[PDB]
Design a protein around this ligand. Structure first.
Ligand code: YLO
Ligand code: TES
Length: 250
């Protein structure tokens, strides 16, 4: 009996509703103000998920908040890619049961090319045959995939933590196979998939940052925590002070 997977599966967040009035015409301001609200709500869930992760309260308290606040985009995109694959066979974007994106909403949001990228990512889940155990490990692993170039308050704890999640992923892959190249292939595949979440998250950091700057001119609302994170933390990523941790060089 695997204690690590039990935990990952126990703490997985439920459904989060976007609060969207689907009875509105699909306007830009309204799709975007709703996505923002989805962001702010999902944040609360990510925090409590992250805090109930194995080894996590180990990290220094400020590092705990830092790594949540750099990594959120990556996490939410990956999950949403999954929700999309499990429900709507990847065909649309399952932001929340009350906020699914069709083509038309992908154009109206004005972030059409990002949505296409998110859709693709979503499809990889099918193409690779990602099991729910792989999904869960990879997603938790994503929490420790982006950090300040000049390290964290307790970087050693962090590096140990991350190493452990990597080895746990290797475990979920390997406790079921036989032939030799099989487990190499697969691990290569997942490290590549995990890597590819980063340029997408980066496109979306740019996007939302831009939006926030021009939100008064455009009637898009940003909730308190989303405002703050996007103006304090995202800029550290955009300017290159915080950076992802790739497995492979691009
Ligand atoms: C809530 C809780 C309880 C016990 C914990 O023990 C730490 C275990 N741990 C760790 S160790 C974190 C490294 O930092 C430390 C902290 C204290 C002493 C030595 C190293 N990495 C893990 C990866 C997967 C699963 C568990 C992992 C962590 C959180
Ligand atoms: C950041 C953002 C609001 C929050 C969105 C984000 C797109 C990706 C995303 C996926 C989710 O499943 C929840 C909300 C988030 C995190 C949106 C892109 C522009 C908008 O400002």
């Amino acid at each position: 009996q695997p204690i690590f997977l039990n935990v990952l599966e126990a703490i997985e967040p439920g459904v989060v509703c976007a609060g969207h009035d689907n009875n509105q015409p699909d306007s830009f301001a309204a799709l975007l103000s709703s996505l923002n609200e989805l962001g702010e709500r999902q944040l609360v869930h990510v925090v409590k998920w992250a805090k109930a992760l194995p080894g996590f309260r180990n990290l220094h308290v400020d590092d705990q908040m830092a790594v949540i606040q750099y990594s959120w985009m990556g996490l939410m995109v990956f999950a949403m890619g999954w929700r999309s694959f499990t429900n709507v066979n990847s065909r649309m974007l399952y932001f929340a049961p009350d906020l699914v994106f069709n083509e038309y909403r992908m154009h109206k949001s004005r972030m059409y090319s990002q949505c296409v990228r998110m859709r693709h990512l979503s499809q990889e889940f099918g193409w690779l045959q990602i099991t729910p155990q792989e999904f869960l490990c990879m997603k938790a692993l994503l929490l420790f995939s982006i950090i300040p170039v000049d390290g964290l308050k307790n970087q050693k704890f962090f590096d140990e933590l991350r190493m452990n999640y990597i080895k746990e992923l290797d475990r979920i892959i390997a406790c079921k196979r036989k032939n030799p190249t099989s487990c190499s292939r697969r691990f290569y595949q997942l490290t590549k998939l995990l890597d590819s979440v980063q340029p997408i998250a980066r496109e979306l950091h740019q996007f939302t940052f831009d939006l926030l700057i021009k939100s008064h001119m455009v009637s898009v609302d940003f909730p308190e925590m989303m405002a703050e994170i996007i103006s304090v933390q995202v800029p550290k990523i955009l300017s290159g002070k915080v950076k992802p941790i790739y497995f492979h060089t691009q």
